Amino acid sequence: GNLWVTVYYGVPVWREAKTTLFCASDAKAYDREVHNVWATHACVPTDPNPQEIVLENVTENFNMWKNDMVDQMHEDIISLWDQSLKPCVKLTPLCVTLNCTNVTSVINEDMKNCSFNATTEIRDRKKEMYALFYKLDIVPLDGEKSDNRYRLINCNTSTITQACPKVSFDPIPIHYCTPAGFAILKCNNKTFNGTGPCNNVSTVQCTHGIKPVVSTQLLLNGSLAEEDIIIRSENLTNNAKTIIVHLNESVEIVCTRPNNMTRKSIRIGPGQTFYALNDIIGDIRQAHCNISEEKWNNTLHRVWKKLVEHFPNKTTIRFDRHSGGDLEITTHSFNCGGEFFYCNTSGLFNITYNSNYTYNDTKHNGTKVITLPCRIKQIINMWQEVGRAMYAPPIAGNITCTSNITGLLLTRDGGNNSTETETFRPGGGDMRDNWRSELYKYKVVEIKPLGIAPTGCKRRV
């Protein structure tokens, strides 16, 4: 009948934790290929043959919107961006009066031929150089005369550090690993909607190598769903929360810049030189992206069906374009082949679906695509808290990329009463949501190996 306190070490229990994690890049990423923004040599090598241990008979409560790993990843990406932009040449002497004129071929109407005086290797003589600059990067001086005098866009807000000539923007998988005394719980529930209980949860040491793809209104090169479309929102009845639609069938999107462009080195000062656009070889065609019409019809139909399931009694659901603002939020912004693309999405989100039409099966095949026009900037200022922008290096030859859209960053409109209509527009808010599309299953748990259990064993005197 008598019982005594017994101590157990190695007890499998855990609580919540907010510990700092450490990165781990893949071993194949160490085959030289140096000087990429996301290539961090301080990351440890990825653990070979990694283990995921299935934990049966246990249920865990997850919450994507209260995860600290997303915030840690955002901060780590920001400081990596700062470290990569720190060393090379700044374009502060480039903030000078630019004599800009039209670009000789039809008019491009997207670039201007700007000549400027740049100091030579000696800072007492100045040579009149010239370069082709995008119209989104040059603001006209004054604003009341056609004097053809322009300047760089951020010559009055912060400083520009031009991207180093070797740098690359190719994403690589990053395996976030948790320290000793802590583990990562992954929810293997395929139906899981981002929060709540999970009856199939496994413990892992490191994540699945999340690619840090920077994109707005769309999710590029992300992990797909397993069963169906998974709609995730912190609070659906709140219109400020951004819905993260998770597709199960990724759609191929092919983007290109068919123009062939020349690169020329320009000396802006003693020991400071940067690469700039010189000439356009061949005909002039606008850069654009192609998305299959039938596949997008499939995606929009399935998304509307899931949104009808999540929003009862709404007769009509309209997919319209973005409301307004700067170009970085109103357009699909991404990076293809080292070049930053801003693509108009008015042709994609333009439909009205009602519950009284079957809408067929969106069959009858077809090779028709949606040619969404795109524009290119070089003065890139993302994550504006850093205080430092970029001058992206010019790329010779065409650029052509093929990516997969695996999710949409939808956002419901404001309160328009109970008129049985809700208009969902593309979002483009904080970039943290993008990482939240990947860390929707991972939580960090703090191991307590010390346990107390009554047993009829008594220690001797």
């Binding site: 008598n2 019982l3 005594w4 306190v5 017994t6 101590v7 157990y8 070490y9 190695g10 007890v11 499998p12 229990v13 855990w14 510990t19 700092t20 994690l21 450490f22 990165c23 961090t40 301080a42 990351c43 440890v44 283990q51 241990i53 934990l55 049966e56 008979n57 246990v58 400081s79 470290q83 320290p179 000793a180 005394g181 802590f182 583990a183 413990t203 191991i447 307590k448 190996p449 010390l450 346990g451 107390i452 259990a453 009554p454 047993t455 009829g456 064993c457 008594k458 220690r459 005197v461």
Partner: protein, 125 residues
Amino acid sequence: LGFLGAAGSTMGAASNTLTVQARQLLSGLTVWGIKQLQTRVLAIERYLEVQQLLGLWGCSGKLICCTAVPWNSSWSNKSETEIWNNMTWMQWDREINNYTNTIYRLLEESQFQQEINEVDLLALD
């Protein structure tokens, strides 16, 4: 099974694997080195904390160590079989979370009194 593989298992089965969880408790430019360094010394601090707590109970160097502290029925009126047969470690952690500090103090005063009276008796001989 592996690390945490008996978390959903019963108490008796989870007591049979304890070393693989004690393995993980140690394991093992200017900013990321700082972060890795800080989290390594943090994990080292937790391991030293748990080892010190084990040492203060007279259970250093052991995984399962008995203690002559009587089990108070106010902590748990459940008898041994439903603790050790149809119960997990997490549910026991949930029930005995309120009495953890009191149990810890009872262990430390028991071990300290054992050392003190061992010294008192062995000095007589």
